[PDB]
Design a binder for this molecule. Structure first.
Ligand SMILES: [Mg+2]
Ligand SMILES: [Mg+2]
Ligand SMILES: [Mg+2]
Ligand SMILES: [Mg+2]
Ligand SMILES: [Mg+2]
Ligand SMILES: [Mg+2]
Ligand SMILES: [Mg+2]
Ligand SMILES: [Mg+2]
Ligand SMILES: [Mg+2]
Ligand SMILES: [Mg+2]
Ligand SMILES: [Mg+2]
Ligand SMILES: [Mg+2]
Ligand SMILES: [Mg+2]
Ligand SMILES: [Mg+2]
Ligand SMILES: [Mg+2]
Ligand SMILES: [Mg+2]
Ligand SMILES: [Mg+2]
Ligand SMILES: [Mg+2]
Ligand SMILES: [Mg+2]
Lengths: 60, 175, 126, 52, 49
RNA sequence: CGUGGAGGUCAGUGACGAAGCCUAGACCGUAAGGUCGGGUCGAACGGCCUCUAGUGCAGAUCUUGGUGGUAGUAGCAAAUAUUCAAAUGAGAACUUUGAAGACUGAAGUGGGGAAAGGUUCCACGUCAACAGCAGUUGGACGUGGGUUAGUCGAUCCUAAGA
RNA sequence: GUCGAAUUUGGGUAUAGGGGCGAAAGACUAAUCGAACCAUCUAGUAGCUGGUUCCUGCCGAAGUUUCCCUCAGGAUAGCAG
RNA sequence: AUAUUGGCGAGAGACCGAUAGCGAACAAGUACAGUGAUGGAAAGAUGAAAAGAACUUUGAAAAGAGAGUGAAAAAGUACGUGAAAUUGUUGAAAGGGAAGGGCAUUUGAUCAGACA
């Protein structure tokens, strides 16, 4: 019903839903055969990877 | 998570719960039953009147040797009470449910209490000393309360050959 | 099958020994094999892992990642490699506890004692 | 162990005491006091016909 | 600090349910009291009034 | 017929889900029982030939643990007594100050000690549990501060005694 | 009821269980006294009470006889395989 | 050459598997009781990894609702599985001083087999 897309006591757990998805992929294979922190850190890693004279010989 | 009952199409529902609440299980069961099925704002105004002692909560199951009142007549009973602690806990959960529905964007004028459930929490075990050096239990009976509000919205027959022949004859007779 | 009368096959005793082993025994317990190139270069198969050597992860979800050993947490039978972490949105970084038998040493941290260990295990460095 | 279930100080409370006549642990101040003892039907008691 | 405080609060819950006055309240009730369950009262002096 | 464990075998079952548990579903046995489907669950377990036993429960005022009805019931009525405003606070019959009304009535509901207790004293913070209503208060919870002797006692003396 | 003494009372001290102490009640001796409390021998002793855990098939009784003087407890005959 | 339920060091089992097995698998001869001699418990299991739930929002707060972590939160420090007694909600039904059970059938609900 959820794939097709009141008060009830019929709910489907995510554990069972993931198992149904996995088993359906098994059946399909048989039928055929028959992060901002990460980006900031990498950006920082990529980034880091006559003259002049003032005063003179006298005591101010 | 894991309510006693859920809403199909949860996009039009909001829920609230409170666990291990140190309030009388029996009084709260009667309060939640007085609320069950109502429109939300109507329930809130009713509970305010109950605290004001203008209307009353009917006591239907846990009511042995309760007094009688004239405010029970609206619900067709004689035994009704005004449990303040229960009403305040239930009002807190109702306000939370309304807040959740507003955060979801539900229409507050169409919300009604589609589910409300009171279960027994684990007991609070005090003891009392009694005559002849006895220890007796002296316990609190707390509640788990949960509730869901919801927006209110608005042939093959097999005939025998005899039956088929009768129908065909009827059609031939008729126009 | 064991032949010595001084060795025990008792599971309860073996597990108690593992879980109450002190730090010096845990060093030996936390050994890691060498890579193919290092194995050919030094002529030895495995060494007790230490703090400054470079490893390759060869098992688990972090397989194929490389880095330098950050710490050898003997109290929890694990090692932590500086580049192998788990990150949260609030900026938190938690090191992954890796077992050294699921690692491979790619660069050894050599000192006098480590060279002596290799040579007494039969190594042929340089 | 041939001492299993017997290292206990317990005695029956007698007949007509509105409780079963199994021997019960004496003393006070702990949950063990008053509990049934020694019997193969009692928690912490001696098994019937202990293995030898 | 906040994590350890939350840990201590979560630990407290069963003793609070048993209504202990604190960590130090370890009063133990006996299972049965002999003075309450050793009655066979003749015609004469009793153990209470 | 069923159960814990043992020898042999089915190169037996199992992460495409072992065992356990729930089940308005299915079948086989006169029956003990066995078998299959669905749900839940997560790591092991069965058929057969045999070996072995701490091997099958409704009772024992049985044992240990858990839970009902009674029931929001009995009751929370000794010791003459409370009331007003402000403050604090999410919240005040019960905290604090003030305003009042009373009481103990010096053989005290006052001021100190002995035995016993051992920090309960006092300040700051502070309310989950406890204070059979309540609580912002506490002899509660958390962290500290505090007991100064040549002259007060012990210490010395002997008593019944040991 | 008694209330200035055969008075009331703190503390120290003495007497310990087949013992003590008793203006004598078998009182009292730590809610324990016709026998204190604690551990052990000890799972002490049964004329008696209670209980004693799966299925089905087939077979299936016993108060009627002698005795140890008689009660008690046993022996013997019968009946069921 | 014999003994050895104490001490020290080892190897094992057709043993028990948290009401079992030592009283004690755990800060157990502990906590607690008693003037004393003595008496004497209960109590093991999140996850591979604390990644033990940031952030927003309602609330005085505990908390809730979103969000997120994780294979899983039908694992949330009440934490593996999660039975029964007992309880709540929902749905269906029955009820003129008990209920339960047997034979048989009506009604309603629900269901398997056999379909060449
Ligand atoms: Mg009444
Ligand atoms: Mg008393
Ligand atoms: Mg035992
Ligand atoms: Mg399964
Ligand atoms: Mg048995
Ligand atoms: Mg039973
Ligand atoms: Mg029976
Ligand atoms: Mg009984
Ligand atoms: Mg019981
Ligand atoms: Mg009343
Ligand atoms: Mg009064
Ligand atoms: Mg006066
Ligand atoms: Mg007066
Ligand atoms: Mg004070
Ligand atoms: Mg109170
Ligand atoms: Mg304090
Ligand atoms: Mg045990
Ligand atoms: Mg669970
Ligand atoms: Mg049930």
């Amino acid at each position: 019903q959820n794939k097709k897309n009141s008060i009830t006591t019929r709910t489907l757990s995510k554990k069972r839903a993931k198992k149904i998805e996995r088993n359906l992929k098994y059946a399909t294979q048989r039928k055929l055969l028959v992060s901002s922190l990460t980006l900031v850190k990498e950006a920082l890693w990529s980034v880091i990877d006559q003259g002049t004279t003032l005063g003179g010989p006298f005591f101010p | 998570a894991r309510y006693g009952a859920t809403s199909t199409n949860p996009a039009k529902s909001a829920s609230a719960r409170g666990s291990y609440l140190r309030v009388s299980f029996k009084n709260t069961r009667e309060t939640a039953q007085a609320i069950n099925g109502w429109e939300l704002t109507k329930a809130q105004k009713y509970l305010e009147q109950v605290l004001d002692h203008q209307r009353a909560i009917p006591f239907r199951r846990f009511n042995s040797s309760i007094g009688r009142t004239a405010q029970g007549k609206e619900f067709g009973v004689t035994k009704a009470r005004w449990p303040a602690k229960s009403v305040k806990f239930v009002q807190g959960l109702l306000q939370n449910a309304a807040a959740n529905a507003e955060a979801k964007g539900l229409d507050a004028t169409k919300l009604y209490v589609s589910h409300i459930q009171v279960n027994q929490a684990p007991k609070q075990r005090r003891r009392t000393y009694r005559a002849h050096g006895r220890i007796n239990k002296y316990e609190s009976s707390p509640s788990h309360i949960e509730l869901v509000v919801t927006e209110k919205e608005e042939k093959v027959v097999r005939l025998t050959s005899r039956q088929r022949g009768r129908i065909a004859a009827q059609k031939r007779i008729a126009a | 099958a064991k032949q010595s009368l001084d060795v025990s096959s008792d599971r309860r005793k073996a597990r108690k020994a593992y879980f109450t082993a002190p730090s010096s025994q845990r060093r030996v317990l936390l050994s890691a094999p060498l890579s193919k190139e290092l194995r050919a270069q030094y002529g030895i198969k495995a060494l007790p892992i230490r703090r400054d050597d470079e490893v390759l992860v060869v098992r688990g979800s972090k397989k194929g990642q490389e880095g330098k050993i950050s710490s050898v947490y003997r109290l929890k039978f694990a090692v932590q490699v500086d580049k192998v972490t788990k990150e949260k949105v609030n900026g938190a970084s938690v090191p992954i506890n890796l077992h050294p038998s699921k690692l491979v040493i790619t660069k050894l941290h050599l000192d006098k004692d480590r060279k002596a260990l290799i040579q007494r295990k039969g190594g042929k460095l340089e | 162990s041939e001492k299993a279930g017997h290292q206990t100080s317990a005695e029956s409370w007698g007949t007509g005491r509105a409780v079963a006549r199994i021997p019960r642990v004496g003393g006070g101040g702990t949950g063990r006091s008053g509990q049934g003892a020694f019997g193969n039907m009692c928690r912490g008691g001696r098994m019937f016909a202990p293995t030898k | 600090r906040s994590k350890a405080d939350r840990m201590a609060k979560m630990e407290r819950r069963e003793r609070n349910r048993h209504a202990k006055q604190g960590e130090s309240d370890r009063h133990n009730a006996v299972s049965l009291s002999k003075h309450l369950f050793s009655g066979k009262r003749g015609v004469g002096k009793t153990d209470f009034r």
